[PDB]
């Protein structure tokens, strides 16, 4: 049951945050947001650089000096915090789904129903846990007591994408505010005009100033400049697996501060032939196509067994042409378009080059429309291990599908792979799903279905897809720095 | 490969334990315990009572007193002891193992290769957790430092059974030790021989006196007297569903001392139509006939799907006709003879009780051998719900069959008993795996095997066949007191 | 800020809850509960019996069912309803706040800034809970694929007292609620009525039928027959050490039920001569005389070094002078009248005895007002350990105040005691705060301040003041039962 | 009581340790190894480089294959080899504490009673981790199963200083061979030897081949073959905060591999005017001047109260001109020489600088001996934060006496420094403790003691000391990588 969305939401909000305050570029400059449906321009935002990204920075530590209001906050009331968030959230939440799909994409009923329910389960979650993440007492040798707290690592630099605009920053404040961490977030500058409007709910929540500020721009300019800071304790980026390896370097060379990568990969999907047919079928094409194939951990490799490859393959591409492709606010789409031109040329050229290995095109393979980025469900078929299409991500609405023969054929296949963030399994068999889950290398491994995450389990990736985590407790671990204090007693006793 | 046994072994401790020396009875007296293979008296031992659990209950206090060298010794160093203890046990592993079937009945390979397997096992991974099981730095409201200390629990009084001597004193010992405790433990009248020699390598091992005192004894006597204590802090029985009422209310009567029971039951063997039928037989006689089928969690309820029912019994039968009875010291030996007359008797009546309620006798049902407590291998078939075989715990070598049709009845039926220790269920489907497993009311639940217990593994009971747990981590909760200590500082900081 | 009470509120709920929904006693009985204030009737409340409690536990088992809303319930969504109830009671704080006073007798202003404040944090705390407690997987020997799983213990019943009506029930629904039990709740006959209040937001949180029953009576009917019931896993009695017995008894003798115990003690408290003599003196005249002295957890021995004991004497005999006696509804009332006659009459029975074994009767000693139960604030100096009121918990507005000299001395005197439920020490040295928060045996040992309560932080005792505990991850092992499933595996890796 | 000691003990181990065997290196290239007390060549060494590490690394990768024997073992028989080669490194304890003193300088007294000691008391702690790390089963929404797998990293390469020889190794690979890592190690250039021989230990021991290779050689060569290769899943560095840069640099343009540092510092050692005075400066002596002040977590900077200054500097000298230079050999040594030439020119200079700046000279300042690295015992006074050896880590026997008046001034001065390793607070008083312990921004804070390790608590640092730990379960978490396996079940109850 989802409400009628304003097709041409307001925007109220498109300067740099700071101190809970609304601030323009010091070089006075913008740059602007595109609607990916219509080529229109929404409006004009806030271009920050080094300078701004300064600002924002000394805000951060000066929120984080000992003995400020967000250090003497119990952490009880950081949950408290996060609580109201979700709830100011949840108040604006067929707005804010609106302002989303008009600046990504994506289908409304999908940012409303999907996208926004899992903003605010993942805020709760982490409201939860604010004051649960105990340290120890530790039975060191010797009469000492010696304990271990847990404090936050600081100011936190956190660079998010735009496949999942509230999602991600949801993901990111949420184990860092709960943890006691400041943020100076940098947001996509496809997608920034959302992950605004929430930083002036943080505002309205209560959240004392500097303890979270967004910095929109570009990422030469301002992601680099987060992550070359002398005073930022931690960086955590999430988009491709090229602009990561500039970031671990200009950390490296700068203060030695934390590091957390967060990048793509190319996801296999494995169908056994006792697999529910239909169930698989369905689930193969949402491995994949889910939000524009715009998923880090999506299906790109659609594995079948050769006894039912054929009929896998038949009903695939059936699925794939009844794909519903338009507007993003009517009802009936089922997929948008493209996040920006960059993306869409770059999907086309993937689709140039599967034909050109001799992937065998078996449905749309071009535009969807003469208007915005939209591209037709597209499904190659017989592709091979060595093809471009069957390594590099795509990140858009191109399904490879492969066959295999032997489950342990499959099991290399699959593994042989620079990445390693997901990986997926469809069979009956208790023997079998054991088996590939605990042989395929990939950070969360699904089993007779696909893209399910909860706010409460884990998120990271193996290989080049990776390190550190997303959700659950050990989201945690990462914005946690732990001081042992160790003191000399008179007679220690068990 | 297992070395050749002293089928006679000497018994070099028959006394009561007490401040790691060796004393009489205050009363002088003694029994006899007995060779359940022979029906020969082994030898004499001392019989304790109130006065002698006084003695031992108060050695326990003096060893636990602030300050003494078990109160100052680093956790580490009784992680040290364990290892000691177990690496002693090992030295003198073929005797032990010699011991325990002289005095059990069991066969001596799987003494040697199972039961004294186990025992090292057990003491070494809890000899890893002394130094291991932390206290808490809780993130409490307002200007405090709250954490917690875990403590141990105090004197344990534990009431070990006989089907497992050797293993239970392990699995008793190894938490409570590795957290510190004391314990005044009360043996199996029927085999006490065993533990008192390993309470002579305790001494060896190098344990302050009277952190560990042993008791032989009755159970209206030296049992009740344990549970009545008024300076017990903790009492741990293992038996009889009947006895432990007895424990529970002499203890609540007494002085509120912490009360953990470790009960009987008639745990369910499902074996779905498409199980792997070689292995679902043989595993199905292993989870009941096992241990002369003295087994707290045995597969007292064998249920198999209709279809493959006739097909099931046929070779159940066969498996069971082949099973070699006879002396516990020959290699060939699958089962030995009955713990003593009064189980033996005890069997025998549940046999003819069978026959009586209309179950069909398919092999075996009497006596094995004219000398001894050997009983044949026993399987009714066509068994009903509610025929007493199908639902009072036997604790022999007798097997209930019975048949059904649907999943959904299945799990009604196993789950309609007083009992829920264990289940099992055998079948290739995950979905039936998953369900069943999340469906059956037990705490143990194996899927395609049976009596699997690692020494990591938690062991606890829903209903009537117990509270609280063995093994694992959980184990250590069970003697642990937990103290929170919150201080008063200037000002709190995250 | 305390928002202007309605000195005699409007009693919506006084019936019995079973399935949401108000019932009268099977018997059609009632009975009357009193304004300690007045000594006046304020309502009639049913009487529950055996009969009404097994309305309620078959309530409690039917929703309880694998397959009903409360058992498939999303764990997340169990924190949802948590916080919507607490969400209610926030909505009423004002009410709830002038009824708690109304019928307990303690002062608005507690009831409304400290009672109830500290029911929000529990329920909102616990809610937190609901979607973090996990199970393990286990790296067993072997192949096998070894996990746990935290289920609820089951139908729950809970016998909460009258000292804190409000806060004692969140303490219980809390962990209980966020764990997936369901509960049978026996509330006191002395202050009913809140507890009925909050079971109505229960039904309007949303809460499946059944979950939640409370049941007003007496405790040797009612509380006999939870305890007693065939059907109940778990009990958990809150109040006097010799009720407590009885219910291990009735428990132990009925179905072998869990078991947990909250009862009274004798708290010591400690001021060393370095101590802040005016911190000192304010926290333990608080640390005794809080909520009418009604305290389990109470500093009835305060202990106090001969250097400074004069002057800390003439000092607390000022403030207990000076602490104002009067209707709970006036801002200046510190202390209002004790909950009922009973109450009144035992304890000016202490004061007497106190007198006859010779203490100084230092300030008040008899009847603060011919109308209601307002007894003046008792001090008694150079109390002595054998003394009747120097070991017997008095519940009640009297001070005993005691001279030591060593530390050896007063830790000795200090432990010297059947309970162990709290203790506290004040002084300015670290190694003399250490010292004694790791001698003194008490659950809780506070350093500097006394009755320092977080919702994330364990209350539990030593000795016979309890076993097991409320608040903090700790009470949420007393409502879950550990299931291990041990799944056979092809081959494992690690 | 100390065995006497081989002065000159027979080296037998001085090749590349891959695959349980003795390799040359490729280049045929060796290089030597000074004894500091002599100067003189102990022996050759084989000098590995990039072809060198790439055999070690495509070994360790073999071991590691799905299915090896390192593999497919059980957790607990990972234990059991950890325990294993400490029982071999204790039978040859004796030898290895003399070759540890003959390599690196330091005392054999301290060699065998402190070194040895922790080095088995770490592996030993590390054994009992082995089967105890547990993963997650997580209360996901919907109607599935999820749960974690924590399985090991993978490679681990491995970078280890000189000042701890034998425990940096063990503090390497305790942790990683305890979660099923393999690891490719590579020793300091200073002090190969007793790594080496240890390597022919874990060949005795029973680990399989590739499991762990050891690799001798220089940092530019050797150290970055190892951080640079595209095969190393996990780079953990301690040394110098100067090469700390290089690692993560080269690892993060290599192959995006996880990386933990572990570098210098020039932590505080605050000593109030209520401390115990005789306590505090033999304390401060062994802060500072331990293992020849060749400490990372160095008391480098004695900040003393004014009011106590005078009398703590006197003192303090005293001792230090007390303190026995000399033969390592000997008894009464309680300082060695420095490690190499490099190292004793660097301290000279130091010294020299700290002359320059006006920081006044109290006793030593020059060379102990004409022969070998031998200086004499210094200490500064009147030491201001400006000043050079107030600033930078000097790794010698050179002590910093600066002066404080408040305790406000004391935390602000302390906390500036790039350097959070450890920090030390000496006080009679609880409050300053709680207060000092909390605002210190160190990874390790100790009260009224130093350098208490145990190899149950974490090590770890703030800002530029590093990042990740050694020691305790947090150790596990930088060897451990986290899958998530979600599997869809038929219906999900709690």
Redesign the interface.
Known sequence: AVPAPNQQPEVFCNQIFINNEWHDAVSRKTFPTVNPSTGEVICQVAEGDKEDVDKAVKAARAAFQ??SP???????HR??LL?RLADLIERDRTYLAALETLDNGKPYVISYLVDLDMVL?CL??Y????????????????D?????????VGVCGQIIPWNFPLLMQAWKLGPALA??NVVVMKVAEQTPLTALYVANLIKEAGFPPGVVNIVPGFGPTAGAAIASHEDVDKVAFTGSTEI??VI??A???S??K??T?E?GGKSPNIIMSDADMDWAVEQAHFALFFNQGQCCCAGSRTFVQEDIYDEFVERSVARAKSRVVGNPFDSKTEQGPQVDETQFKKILGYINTGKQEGAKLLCGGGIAADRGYFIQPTVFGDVQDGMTIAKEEIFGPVMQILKFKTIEEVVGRANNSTYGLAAAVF?????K???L???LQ????????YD?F???????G?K?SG?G?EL???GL?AYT??????????????
Chains 1, 2, 3, 4 share one sequence.
């Open positions: 000992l003995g967000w250090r003497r906050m119990d952490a009880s949950g408290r609580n389960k709760r979650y409201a939860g846990w604010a004051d649960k993440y105990h340290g120890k007492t530790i039975p060191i040798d010797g000492f007591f010696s304990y271990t707290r847990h404090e936050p943890t006691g990561g390896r671990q370097v950390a490296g060379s203060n030695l934390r590091v990568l990048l069979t009956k068999d208790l023997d799903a054991n088996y889950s605990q042989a990939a950070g969360t491994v699904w089993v007779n279905c399910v909860g706010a409460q389990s884990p998120f990271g193996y080049m390190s985590q659950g407790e050990y671990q720095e732990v001081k042992t204090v160790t003191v000399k007693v008179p007679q220690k006793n068990s």
